[PDB]
Symmetry: C3
Subunit: 262 residues, 3 copies
Amino acid sequence: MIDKSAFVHPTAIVEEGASIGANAHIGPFCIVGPHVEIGEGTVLKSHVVVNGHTKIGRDNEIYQFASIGEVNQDLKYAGEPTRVEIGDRNRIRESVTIHRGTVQGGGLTKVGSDNLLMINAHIAHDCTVGNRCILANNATLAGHVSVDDFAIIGGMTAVHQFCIIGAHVMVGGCSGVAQDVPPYVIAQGNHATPFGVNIEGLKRRGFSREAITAIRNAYKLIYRSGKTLDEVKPEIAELAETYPEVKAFTDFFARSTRGLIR
Amino acid sequence: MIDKSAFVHPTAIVEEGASIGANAHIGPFCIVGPHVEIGEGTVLKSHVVVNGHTKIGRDNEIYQFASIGEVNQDLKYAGEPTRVEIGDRNRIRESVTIHRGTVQGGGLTKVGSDNLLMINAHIAHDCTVGNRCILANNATLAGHVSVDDFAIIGGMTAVHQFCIIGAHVMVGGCSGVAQDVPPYVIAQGNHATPFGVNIEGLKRRGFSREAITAIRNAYKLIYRSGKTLDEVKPEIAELAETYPEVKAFTDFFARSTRGLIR
Amino acid sequence: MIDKSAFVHPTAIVEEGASIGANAHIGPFCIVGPHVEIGEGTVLKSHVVVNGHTKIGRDNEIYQFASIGEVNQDLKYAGEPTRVEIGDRNRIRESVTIHRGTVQGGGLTKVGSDNLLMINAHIAHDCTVGNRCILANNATLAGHVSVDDFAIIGGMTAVHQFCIIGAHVMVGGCSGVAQDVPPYVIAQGNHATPFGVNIEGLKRRGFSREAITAIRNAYKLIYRSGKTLDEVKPEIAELAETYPEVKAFTDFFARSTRGLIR
């Protein structure tokens, strides 16, 4: 159904079943599918396409030429009624693409809130994206990719399917990411390599000097110890008992699959 | 002319002379030129632009924001009535671009069948593309480029004008291709380099173990012999007399211009 | 106001206050804001978006899916009425983006004349672009970037905010530019490096053999002398007294901030 308070540009095409929230705004030449759900105060500038089984939050801003809920580029996919969930307060820039999941992958492509998806940024089937993230121009995510909170991805950067990107992480741009990227680190180059701890961000974010240091130590333990993960894991765990920020490493390790970057 | 069985969204703009096949489908806000020819069962999702002297097959699927038959970015080009031919069963993704040829280059940009042109993939004036190919996200082809059957091109990969890309070849992605790429090989890096034989594909494709080996030998002959091409050519030719898959090398060599990758 | 001689496609949406020049051409499904000013003989193919406080010259050609005057991706920006000025005779290709400036940056994004902005090329808030330039496919400019006359930028090339790009310069493509790029040079690679003097262009442009040589010497002085800039500056200045083409180095140095490439 559609809100009396909602604005629908005469030129737009809303399909029957499409549910549109109050005070939302649908600009010219947009197309909204019958299974779409657009939250309050959300805006579709114009020439936007929203289809599939898509759920979109409130106060989102979506620019022209974006294509959301679209069918994916998987060859196995065949019209199965997969989904897309998008949080609130996102800013989705021109030409951005967000594809519906695969039953195989789990049928769901998810995007959190308060994120910034720059131009031509691409989100593949079955990804998962947190909050307060930033994906720069042309950044491209492969299928099954997971990006965590506060993560920032350099433009023209490619993330390889199944990879995980830690919270507070910083990815160069003009980079290629093939293994998992642990929290708080900065990565770089074609085949990213760790450059250390994203201090600046931790700073800007409110982290204590102690955590920031605790964090720094963990990194060392990891990349500098010369020990194998299997040997450090515990060391970190311990540390996490005093410094909570560290537990992040742990949880992450528990998800890592492509192993980490080096 | 237009098929009574063909669907034309009221919002679309079909120009007089535009010939549209049976059961084709033209979505909202599309524009089809007067010299366009769209085959049976072909679909234009919406917000699509087809112009120029363009011939499009059947059962093709073309997504929003694609621009086909468009005029090219050559500075010498001046409105000459050049062409574009597209086969059948292709899947042309959002924001893809396919430009009309140059009289100089030969006036024709051609695309085969059953290909997969991912997002923002770009096909320049005068290219030639086979069948069952895949061009990934942001892949960009320069003018006069030739891509052969079963070829696969990594996303964010650039191919340099006049280059040739062998059948069954695999190109990395985040790569730059400046010389010709012989059949069955895998290439990689900014200034691609051979990595060997795309075994996996040959496997998946039905190639015999013998051909696959014959192929493997030819590669060696090429890159490992330490002989100059002029010296190996014959060796290969011979081999091709027993293993037909090999003749591919030959034909290729007969087209190579930028010389090969190393 | 709008010219009786101007063509406005019924489907387009021109806002009240939008001033459109004589003999201009506004294609289907375009949107022109109330503060837009489009010069004589300028063309908007279709599905184009022009908004903000934008001033556009004459005889410009703008292709579908371009987005001009759009609001920028700066997080500090908040709806301040910043501007965009575009010269004449430009050719702005599909999916190009040109964003409005920031009050902070100076509130103005400017583009000269006779330039060629290829597909998906991106111009950030507060940039400055000269004349007769070329930005290739996917080329992306960061904020506060300055590109000078005759400059040419390789596709898939990224320029870092605050950088300056000399006149007659040539940038590789699949490159990353982080420091200023002096006039007449060729740059390349991920983290561009000087390759020498763009002789070919100087040739094609009409430069004398003497200037071309004078130029060549200056380069040497710079990169080969092994002296520090502070020590060469004067040497060059002097030289500029006889060879005017050289003064370019000087002026440039006077703007350089990120220092130069090496």
